[PDB]
Design an enzyme around this catalytic site. Structure first.
Site, PDB file in Angstrom:
ATOM      1  N   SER A  86      41.411  40.389  29.349  1.00  0.00           N
ATOM      2  CA  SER A  86      40.008  40.747  29.092  1.00  0.00           C
ATOM      3  C   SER A  86      39.523  40.261  27.715  1.00  0.00           C
ATOM      4  O   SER A  86      39.600  39.073  27.408  1.00  0.00           O
ATOM      5  CB  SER A  86      39.824  42.259  29.262  1.00  0.00           C
ATOM      6  N   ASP A 210      39.657  43.729  41.050  1.00  0.00           N
ATOM      7  CA  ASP A 210      39.064  43.938  39.714  1.00  0.00           C
ATOM      8  C   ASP A 210      37.532  43.990  39.748  1.00  0.00           C
ATOM      9  O   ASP A 210      36.895  42.978  40.027  1.00  0.00           O
ATOM     10  CB  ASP A 210      39.505  42.837  38.735  1.00  0.00           C
ATOM     11  N   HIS A 238      41.666  46.105  37.554  1.00  0.00           N
ATOM     12  CA  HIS A 238      41.514  45.591  36.197  1.00  0.00           C
ATOM     13  C   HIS A 238      42.744  45.808  35.317  1.00  0.00           C
ATOM     14  O   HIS A 238      42.958  45.050  34.363  1.00  0.00           O
ATOM     15  CB  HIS A 238      40.295  46.235  35.535  1.00  0.00           C
TER      16      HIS A 238
END
Ligand code: NA
Ligand code: NA
Lengths: 261, 274
Positions: A86, A210, A238
């Site tokens: 991320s 996700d 995620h």
């Protein structure tokens, strides 16, 4: 600013960069031991805005890129392997743009290279929650964490859910000036054209379930990188690297074994 | 503007409930889920059923609309309201379509008054709450009982994520369309909505459903996280004359999101029951 870091093992160095709200500790339950067993040296650290720097604000992606570069420099581990998730994957991407000499190869998990609509909606919802001063009640906050981070298959498994809920009490995420500033450390423009000049070998991993960073955005990054490729992990939300660590670690270790340090 | 008399509640009050009655054919009573008014069936289900020669009865569940301030009622109160609607219209045994809380009410109605229901389609349903779903219920109750109000953009994002398929969520144009629609279908936080949260399995009801004789189609939506499709499968498995169908690329609001697939399956089923 010195950032806190944990340095383990000897051998080819791998620097892990956590996502928004994650301390270096995020990598220790599931990643570090596996990488140590494979013979790597693992560096984890607290990003600006976490822990000792939780009250930091007004910093940007470039600040965080510089922090990471300085860490690699100060430890004399250039070029290093980099694993990012991320926000951490974004920082790695952007580090490869400005200082490709510091990075030999990388894995980028749950990543994106532009300000897509899902990110826009996330930005707005999170900034609003912050600015409102509203405190979500604890069970409601945990339900949101469950829904946003885990696959369907996990939510169906009664024992797992009990663990993840317990796991949340052991992993509190304080709303801080640092956490809010980290929200800004994300693509604000189309960075794909810039990634077309990154030479390093890169593995982009997308997690099937996700909803925070949908997997197709990872395909876009892998597509843009000349030596990038895309892999998808099924039944992973995620937090795929925590949820399906065996699948995820195998993919990274196979990739890293294939390339020179 | 039609109304029928609801059951007496556990606080000894009798209230009226609004209903709509369209068509002249085979009667179908639609039971909406938590927060849903009878009008929720009108964009996608009612026109198809009327075109197929069914009569459509829709209504505002206790805790919705004119009774949004109702509180202190139970699953049993809502089952009796639904029976009263059927009895008032003299349409026993009636075909029934329920979704989520509405499917739970339909199940429990079949348990206590099977003579009132000839066959049923139960969408997005369960006969018990698993760990995750028990927790989601506790969280919602907590938010309400807390007085805390969700900021509007956060609230919209949560509504989208919880109700639509991954295929919808990845389609930027469709997302815009649903988000605009939310503005036209606000879900007001009311005592009635809070009380509907407890109109849900508190124990395992699957053993009770093994005594339901009526033919039933249970429809699960593949991407539903609010009522996951395996919980629907468990209901169909419990029902001696129930069968299970799963709709791909459909979230919790599948009957609204994939109306053709859902309507086709229901009408195929109803044409062959009993
Ligand atoms: Na590529
Ligand atoms: Na069955």
């Amino acid at each position: 600013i010195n950032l806190a870091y944990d340095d383990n093992g000897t051998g080819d160095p791998v620097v892990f960069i956590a996502g928004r709200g994650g301390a270096g500790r995020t990598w220790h339950p599931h990643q570090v031991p596996a990488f140590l067993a494979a013979g790597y040296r693992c560096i984890t650290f607290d990003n600006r805005g976490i822990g000792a720097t939780e009250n930091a604000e007004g910093f940007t992606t470039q600040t965080m890129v510089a922090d990471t570069a300085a860490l690699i420099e100060t430890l004399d581990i250039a070029p290093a392997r980099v694993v990012g998730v991320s926000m951490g994957a974004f920082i790695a991407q952007e580090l490869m743009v400005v200082a490709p000499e510091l990075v030999s190869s990388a894995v980028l998990m749950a990543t994106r290279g532009r300000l897509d609509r899902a990110r826009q909606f996330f930005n707005k919802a999170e900034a609003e929650l912050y600015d409102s001063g509203v405190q979500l009640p604890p069970t409601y906050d945990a339900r949101a964490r469950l829904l946003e981070n885990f696959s369907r298959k996990t939510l169906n498994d009664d024992v797992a859910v009990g663990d993840w809920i317990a796991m949340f009490s052991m992993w509190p995420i304080k709303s801080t000036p640092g956490l809010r500033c980290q929200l800004d450390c994300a693509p604000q423009t189309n960075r794909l054209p810039a990634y077309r000049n990154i030479a390093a070998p890169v593995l982009v991993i997308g997690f099937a379930d996700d909803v925070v960073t949908p997997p197709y955005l990872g395909r876009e990054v892998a597509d843009a990188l000349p030596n990038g490729r895309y892999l998808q992990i099924p039944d992973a939300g995620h937090l795929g690297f925590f949820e399906r660590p065996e699948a995820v670690n195998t993919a990274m270790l196979k990739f890293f074994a294939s390339v020179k340090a």
